[PDB]
Enzyme design. Structure first.
Site, PDB file in Angstrom:
ATOM      1  N   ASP A   1       8.759 -52.815 -17.826  1.00  0.00           N
ATOM      2  CA  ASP A   1       9.110 -53.694 -18.942  1.00  0.00           C
ATOM      3  C   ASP A   1       9.770 -52.889 -20.071  1.00  0.00           C
ATOM      4  O   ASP A   1       9.240 -52.799 -21.175  1.00  0.00           O
ATOM      5  CB  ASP A   1       7.869 -54.470 -19.436  1.00  0.00           C
ATOM      6  CG  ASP A   1       8.154 -55.646 -20.364  1.00  0.00           C
ATOM      7  OD1 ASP A   1       9.319 -56.123 -20.391  1.00  0.00           O
ATOM      8  OD2 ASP A   1       7.218 -56.083 -21.071  1.00  0.00           O
TER       9      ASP A   1
ATOM     10  N   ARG B   1      11.945 -54.396 -27.683  1.00  0.00           N
ATOM     11  CA  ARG B   1      10.706 -54.937 -28.266  1.00  0.00           C
ATOM     12  C   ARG B   1       9.476 -54.062 -27.964  1.00  0.00           C
ATOM     13  O   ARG B   1       8.463 -54.168 -28.653  1.00  0.00           O
ATOM     14  CB  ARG B   1      10.455 -56.399 -27.819  1.00  0.00           C
ATOM     15  CG  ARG B   1      10.011 -56.530 -26.368  1.00  0.00           C
ATOM     16  CD  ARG B   1       9.992 -57.953 -25.830  1.00  0.00           C
ATOM     17  NE  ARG B   1       9.790 -57.931 -24.379  1.00  0.00           N
ATOM     18  CZ  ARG B   1      10.759 -58.095 -23.484  1.00  0.00           C
ATOM     19  NH1 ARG B   1      11.998 -58.368 -23.877  1.00  0.00           N
ATOM     20  NH2 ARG B   1      10.495 -57.995 -22.188  1.00  0.00           N
ATOM     21  N   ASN B   2       9.579 -53.189 -26.950  1.00  0.00           N
ATOM     22  CA  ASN B   2       8.509 -52.306 -26.500  1.00  0.00           C
ATOM     23  C   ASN B   2       8.635 -50.861 -26.951  1.00  0.00           C
ATOM     24  O   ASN B   2       7.802 -50.057 -26.558  1.00  0.00           O
ATOM     25  CB  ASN B   2       8.410 -52.363 -24.992  1.00  0.00           C
ATOM     26  CG  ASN B   2       7.795 -53.643 -24.543  1.00  0.00           C
ATOM     27  OD1 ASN B   2       6.849 -54.145 -25.151  1.00  0.00           O
ATOM     28  ND2 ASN B   2       8.320 -54.204 -23.482  1.00  0.00           N
TER      29      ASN B   2
ATOM     30  N   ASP C   1       4.436 -49.931 -24.285  1.00  0.00           N
ATOM     31  CA  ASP C   1       4.330 -51.236 -23.658  1.00  0.00           C
ATOM     32  C   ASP C   1       3.454 -52.086 -24.571  1.00  0.00           C
ATOM     33  O   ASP C   1       2.266 -51.802 -24.702  1.00  0.00           O
ATOM     34  CB  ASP C   1       3.675 -51.088 -22.279  1.00  0.00           C
ATOM     35  CG  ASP C   1       3.874 -52.260 -21.343  1.00  0.00           C
ATOM     36  OD1 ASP C   1       4.185 -53.368 -21.832  1.00  0.00           O
ATOM     37  OD2 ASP C   1       3.715 -52.072 -20.122  1.00  0.00           O
TER      38      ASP C   1
END
Ligand SMILES: C[C@@H](c1ccccc1)n1cc(-c2cc(F)cc(F)c2)c(=O)[nH]c1=O
Length: 244
Positions: free
Chosen positions: A121, A125-126, A139
């Site tokens: 992922d 945004r992470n 994460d």
């Protein structure tokens, strides 16, 4: 049994953590930290601790320790996530600063890949930012225990590899060069697989150098095998940053 003993070096005693799911402010003894509460599966969480406690790279968010709802203790990141930072009014990073952020993501990912760690992922945004604006890969919501960022093979087969993470990094570079723009805004969630099979891809951001956009296109090859590794991406992005 042996997993229980192997996680002792990552377990934090309650007489050393003060918490003040979601993320809460907290203090740790061995210091300011972020404590995420986690509202069979506990076994996979414990092995993750063993793996992420080994981490030591300037572009990777470190795992300070774990608690027995189980808690995750991470170092506090003052400027939050990268995507919200590039969309915030108070911060005006130049196009060279955005390229630099991307390079830090690539070096932290090069480190994760050197240790056989498939992120699953990778997205702006992470990625967190500290007080010195150092970008740290992280994460913020379990992935190994987001279709507009997934590789073609991940969409069709559900398989996640380092080459599929390279595809997510190509989308992450687009987010940076567009300053937090949603990728494929007029492509339905249920239509991206066919959209990508048909050859179609994200277009070149207005303020993106031509060699940097070629790099994004290399991350989006239908064949995972044909994609640049993270070591190659660090080499190419360092070269661009040095001459920009
Ligand atoms: C260390 C960091 C990270 C994640 C990915 C890549 C690099 C760094 N990290 C780890 C966990 C985490 C830790 C565990 F001990 C068990 C678990 F299930 C998750 C998390 O929730 N968030 C996060 O940012």
């Amino acid at each position: 049994p042996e997993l229980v003993q192997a996680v002792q070096h990552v377990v934090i005693g309650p007489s050393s953590l003060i918490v003040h799911g979601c993320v809460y402010h907290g203090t740790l003894l061995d210091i300011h930290c972020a404590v995420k509460s986690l509202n069979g599966e506990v076994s996979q969480f414990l092995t993750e601790g063993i793996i992420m406690k080994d981490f030591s790279h300037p572009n990777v968010l470190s795992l300070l320790g774990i608690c027995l709802s189980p808690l995750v203790v991470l170092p506090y990141m003052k400027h939050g996530d990268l995507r919200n930072f590039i969309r915030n009014e108070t911060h005006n990073p130049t196009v060279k600063d955005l390229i630099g952020f991307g390079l830090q993501v690539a070096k932290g990912m090069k480190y994760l890949a050197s240790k056989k760690f498939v992120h699953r992922d990778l997205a702006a945004r992470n990625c967190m930012l500290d007080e010195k604006f150092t970008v740290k890969v992280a994460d913020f919501g379990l992935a190994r225990v987001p279709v507009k960022w997934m590789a073609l093979e991940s969409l069709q087969t559900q398989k996640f590899t380092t080459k599929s993470d390279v595809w997510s990094f190509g989308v992450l570079l687009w987010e940076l060069m567009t300053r937090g723009a949603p990728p494929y805004p007029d492509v339905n969630t249920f239509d991206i697989t066919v959209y990508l099979l048909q050859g179609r891809r994200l277009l070149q951001p207005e303020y993106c150098p031509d060699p940097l956009y070629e790099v994004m296109l290399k991350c989006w090859h239908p064949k995972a095998e044909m994609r640049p590794s993270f070591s190659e991406l660090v080499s190419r992005i360092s070269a661009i940053f040095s001459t920009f």
